[PDB]
Amino acid sequence: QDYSGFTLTPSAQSPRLLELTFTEQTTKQFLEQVAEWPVQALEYKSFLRFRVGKILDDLCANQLQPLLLKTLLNRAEGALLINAVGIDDVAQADEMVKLATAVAHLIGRSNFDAMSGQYYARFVVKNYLRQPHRVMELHNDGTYVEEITDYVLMMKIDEQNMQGGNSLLLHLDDWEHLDHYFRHPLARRPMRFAAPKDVFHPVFDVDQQGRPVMRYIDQFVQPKDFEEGVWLSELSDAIETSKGILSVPVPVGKFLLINNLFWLHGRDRFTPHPDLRRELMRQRGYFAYA
Template structure:
């Protein structure tokens, strides 16, 4: 990030929100919108339904602008600087009080609008083929018969990057908790690339820059396959950017398989990960190539239910 951007962020006065560090790591910023901001945002976007925002893509940017305007455009400056700066690259966003809407479908509509505003302050969400919209909603239950670990409640979902099997660039990931019932555990797991103890071992490996095939199970509704290396690019300072997930890699020989296996074992054994609880309504937003993310396992309960919303996309100016 440029010196000017750093100066702007450190000297500005935030309006309508506060920022703290996550207790376990200064890399992760905790952004809390105050109740007045949330209520003003709800009033500002009440004329549109979520269906209208789905049908008219330009409304997504108007929703974003109205949230940013309420904070005198200080929120957008901070969120963009935070998510694009390699030293941080992630924020947990929540809010105080209530948006003054009824629980149930109306509250869910509000949450979708809020996540839409945040994602379109920093970029443009890609089409999510799994759900058929610019976002995806999915539920984790106690029993599941899906074809990936996304909905498996009783195992740890390993650290990974999103967007490995699609052609669109996936610069950021947003995960929002819409509701939960009878839930213990399931905290978000995160590991910053620069905190991974064995990064150099795998980044300097002969296969680090070799194309690997990546596909997806049928539930993702993406039939094509793509090829790219795990370390597909470097940032402006020459540091590696990563694009990896253990479930969807399709190694073509034993050497590739061994490289991927050992990488996965190293990531899961690394002690530098964060475990982050998320209350209902909160959202985690991270740079997809600085951070790997996953999910801890849940405590079994016959009526366990958690609904999540996901948006992933690319940065815009």
């Protein structure tokens, strides 16, 4: 398939993860057509988040939106690494926020983020949970609020003096222990989840066709007793040692966009360096389509 305005190819890590790259021409026209709205105008007026999405999609002859949706909702796939030729440097952070906003608002809506007070959040890492030699464990987002998070978007804004730190991904259908954990008696028992109002939901559920989906994070699940706590500790080990995990470099200017129901994500350890600098932007939300 030859698409209008972008190309599409499988990643080096997995055929489940597709790489979508906007052509230089699409990128220039996009930036020109959204220059009248600074990032602040997107912050203030949520309708402009959808408008910039429409602008990008029209520049791709209305082929982008159905491709995004089909890829993210397809159980066999459900993940994209996305970039635009010519947006690849920390000095273009505003342009990166604009691009990611447009893509996200073609498939749904980005929820309010408590860490920033906006629909997206940016974080800066320089040199117990912020240990460089520790892996951030695989998890799903949104486990401690009532409404389901359908997607997670993570964009690399900057990277300096950085060895390691790849994003880690696990698709449930590549996880060799899924069948063992999904069939356990505890799998579909509602458990308490709390951040530091509590919600109750199981670790596993099923999609419309009956296939397993997952809502799990070690930090926010609150086992009520020994039985639950021992089972969860083993679950954790069975995720973290999986042979199906992907290790994905996210270069500056690219972002991962993944279906949060059947992908888990995390982050690899990295080398400490006095002049290390890593900057990320995230957006999480719900799918909505006509």
